[PDB]
From a paper:
We also obtained a high-resolution structure of the blade by combining the structures of HA70D3–HA17 and HA17–HA33, which were determined at 2.4 Å and 2.1 Å, respectively. Based on the crystal structure of the HA70D3–HA17 complex, the interactions between HA70 and HA17 bury a solvent-accessible area of ∼795 Å2 (per molecule). The structure of HA70D3 is almost identical to its equivalent domain in the full-length HA70 with a root-mean-square deviation (rmsd) of ∼0.93 Å over 232 Cα atoms. The major HA70–HA17 interactions are composed of 13 pairs of hydrogen bonds and salt bridges. In addition, HA70-Phe547 is buried in a hydrophobic region in HA17 composed of Ile18, Ile92, Ala93, Thr96, and Met140. HA17 has a compact β-trefoil fold and connects HA70 and HA33.
Residue numbers in the entry:
A (entry chain B): 4 to 146
B (entry chain A): 380 to 436, 451 to 626
């Protein structure tokens, strides 16, 4: 009934490619070929008390999208690092800010690209300055 | 025309359910706000469009503020409301007996840039080519807005040429880029002083992005205002 990112299972993609899907691979998060498997499905849940979102892997329900001490997006047990503040900038396109601010800076999911190719690149948490950085834009598609 | 009344002065958020037994007639809602401020008012899916009137207190004066009456036209109102005065909402005929809801929300953010005007939801921009939209025109110095989405898939790169113009009435346009959070809309004022009457200048806008054009009528040459959005690639 909430139109802004309703709860449920999603696919997570980069705007660089509509065929690469976010999944965990050896502690790091990366965009890989369509698997039709549970590890590419993501349970998004809104938390009213914090006014933010937590996102878990459906293959590993206790594991949430978090970040470590070096700027890498990780899968970890629930904590304050798992809290996300999404910004919708297009139909299904989001910039995912961390609820936590260091400096007076916002930090967002960021994916490297090699001429719009993101294969093998790991998901990072990097400074966010505007709504125009392609590497910080992600599609969350309901399934 | 049964006049109904929200006896309690509303604050920040409020939801009023249409009875359903009053849908076969144009009907009115009398209300007041707890505190002076800018409010967004709309039906359930922005349908139907609503009219709002100012009421001075046996009454002294009633003044039309904003809103129109086009069947099947989606819209929402953004209006400055004073806690001292009264307000009427004219809800038109719901010639379909599904129960509607009127939502009132206090705006603390960028949507305040839209007072006072109706914001027309445009949802038929599926392609390139000519499109136009006819509504009752606001008087001089009054506003009418349009929220639309550029066709195509968004990739922060793919872009279309948008020609925005009017048929007869002169108007000054302000173009905003729309983003949304859990706290409502954010607006980036990307263009100002756009003279719409027979405007021949195009604007490149991002495919799949949402925009709002706020128009100030500066010359009323026709009862209606017709906004053209012609898209090329």
């Amino acid at each position: 009934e909430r139109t802004f990112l309703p709860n449920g299972n999603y696919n997570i993609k980069s705007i660089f490619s509509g065929s690469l899907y976010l999944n965990p691979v050896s502690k790091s998060l990366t965009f890989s070929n369509e698997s039709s498997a549970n590890n590419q499905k993501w349970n998004v849940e809104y938390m009213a008390e914090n006014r933010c979102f937590k996102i878990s892997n459906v293959a590993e329900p206790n594991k949430y999208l978090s970040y470590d001490n070096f700027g890498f997006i990780s899968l970890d047990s629930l904590s304050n690092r798992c809290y996300w503040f999404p910004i919708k900038i297009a139909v299904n396109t989001y910039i995912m800010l961390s609820l936590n601010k260091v400096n007076e800076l916002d930090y967002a999911w960021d994916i490297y690209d090699t001429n719009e190719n993101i294969l093998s690149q790991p998901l990072l948490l990097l400074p966010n300055f505007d709504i125009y950085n392609s590497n910080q834009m992600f599609k969350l598609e309901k399934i | 025309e049964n006049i109904q009344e929200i006896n309690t002065a509303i604050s920040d958020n409020y939801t009023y359910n249409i009875p359903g037994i009053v849908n076969n007639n144009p009907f009115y809602i009398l209300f007041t706000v707890n505190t002076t401020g800018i409010y967004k008012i709309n039906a359930q899916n922005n349908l139907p469009s609503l009219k709002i009137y100012e009421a001075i207190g046996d009454i002294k004066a009633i003044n039309y503020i904003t809103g129109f009456d086009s069947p099947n036209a989606k819209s929402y109102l953004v209006v400055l409301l004073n806690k001292d005065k009264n307000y009427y909402i004219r809800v038109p005929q719901t010639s379909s007996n599904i129960e509607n809801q009127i939502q009132f929300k206090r705006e603390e953010g960028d949507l305040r840039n839209l007072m006072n005007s109706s914001v027309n939801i445009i949802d038929n921009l599926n392609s390139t080519g000519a499109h136009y939209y006819t509504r009752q025109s606001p008087d001089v110095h009054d506003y009418i807005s349009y929220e639309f989405t550029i066709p195509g898939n968004f990739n922060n790169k793919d872009t279309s040429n948008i020609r925005l113009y009017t048929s007869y009435n002169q108007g000054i346009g302000t173009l905003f880029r729309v983003t949304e959070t859990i706290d409502g809309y954010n607006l980036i004022n990307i263009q100002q002083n756009l003279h719409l009457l027979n405007n021949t200048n195009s604007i490149r806008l991002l495919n799949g992005a949402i925009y709002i054009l706020k128009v100030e009528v500066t010359e009323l040459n026709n009862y209606n205002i017709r906004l053209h959005i012609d898209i090329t690639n």
